């Protein structure tokens, strides 16, 4: 039972690490899409 | 007059898009 509780705690820690990785991926995606939208607007303004 | 209204609507849409891009550049 202690080994099963340790395995459940390891699975919960892996799920928390996956949630933190998803939050970091969302933050990096927003930080990259900010300059990407800026470059897209700068490219659209020359075509406009 | 219809073609001029469509061109003025396209120009106002382009100006609104440029203003939104300027607001996004000012916020970021």
From Swiss-Prot, chain A:
According to its UniProt record, where is this protein located? Nucleus; Cytoplasm
Give the record's PTM text.
Phosphorylated on tyrosine upon binding to activated CSF1R; which causes a dissociation of the two proteins. Phosphorylation at Tyr-29 modulates mRNA binding.
Q: In which tissues is it expressed?
A: Ubiquitously expressed.
Documented effect of changing residue 29 to F: Impairs mRNA binding, enhances CXCL12-dependent cell migration
What are the disulphide bonds in this sequence?
none
Where, per the database record, does this protein carry Phosphotyrosine?
A: 29
Q: How does it assemble?
A: Component of the THO subcomplex, which is composed of THOC1, THOC2, THOC3, THOC5, THOC6 and THOC7. The THO subcomplex interacts with DDX39B to form the THO-DDX39B complex which multimerizes into a 28-subunit tetrameric assembly. Component of the transcription/export (TREX) complex at least composed of ALYREF/THOC4, DDX39B, SARNP/CIP29, CHTOP and the THO subcomplex; in the complex interacts with THOC1, THOC2, THOC5, THOC6 and THOC7; forms a coiled-coil dimer with THOC7; together with THOC6 and THOC7, plays a key structural role in oligomerization of the THO-DDX39B complex.
Q: What is the recorded function of this protein according to its Swiss-Prot or TrEMBL entry?
A: Component of the THO subcomplex of the TREX complex which is thought to couple mRNA transcription, processing and nuclear export, and which specifically associates with spliced mRNA and not with unspliced pre-mRNA. Plays a key structural role in the oligomerization of the THO-DDX39B complex.
Q: Which family does it belong to?
A: Belongs to the THOC5 family.
Q: What is this protein called?
A: THO complex subunit 5
Point out the gene that encodes the protein. THOC5
Swiss-Prot record, chain B:
- Taxonomically, the superkingdom here is Eukaryota
Q: Where in the cell is it found?
A: Cytoplasm; Nucleus; Nucleus speckle
What is the protein name given in its UniProt record?
A: THO complex subunit 7
Similarity remark: Belongs to the THOC7 family.
Q: Which organism is it from?
A: Homo sapiens (Human)
Q: List the disulfide bonds.
A: none
List the range of the whole protein covered here. 154 to 181 of 204
Quick one: which gene encodes this? THOC7
Q: How does it assemble?
A: Tetramer; as part of a THO-DDX39B complex. Component of the THO subcomplex, which is composed of THOC1, THOC2, THOC3, THOC5, THOC6 and THOC7. Component of the transcription/export (TREX) complex at least composed of ALYREF/THOC4, DDX39B, SARNP/CIP29, CHTOP and the THO subcomplex; in the complex interacts with THOC1, THOC2 and THOC5; forms a coiled-coil dimer with THOC5; together with THOC5 and THOC6, plays a key structural role in the oligomerization of the THO-DDX39B complex. TREX seems to have a dynamic structure involving ATP-dependent remodeling. Interacts with NIF3L1.
What does the function comment of this entry state?
A: Component of the THO subcomplex of the TREX complex which is thought to couple mRNA transcription, processing and nuclear export, and which specifically associates with spliced mRNA and not with unspliced pre-mRNA. Required for efficient export of polyadenylated RNA. Plays a key structural role in the oligomerization of the THO-DDX39B complex. (Microbial infection) The TREX complex is essential for the export of Kaposi's sarcoma-associated herpesvirus (KSHV) intronless mRNAs and infectious virus production.
């Amino acid at each position: 039972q202690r080994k099963r509780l340790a395995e459940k705690y390891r699975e919960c820690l892996s799920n928390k690490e996956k949630i933190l990785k998803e939050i970091e991926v969302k933050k990096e995606y927003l930080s990259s899409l900010q300059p990407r939208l800026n470059s897209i607007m700068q490219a659209s303004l020359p075509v406009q | 007059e219809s073609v001029e209204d469509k061109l003025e609507l396209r120009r106002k849409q382009f100006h609104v898009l440029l203003s939104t891009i300027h607001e996004l550049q000012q916020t970021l």
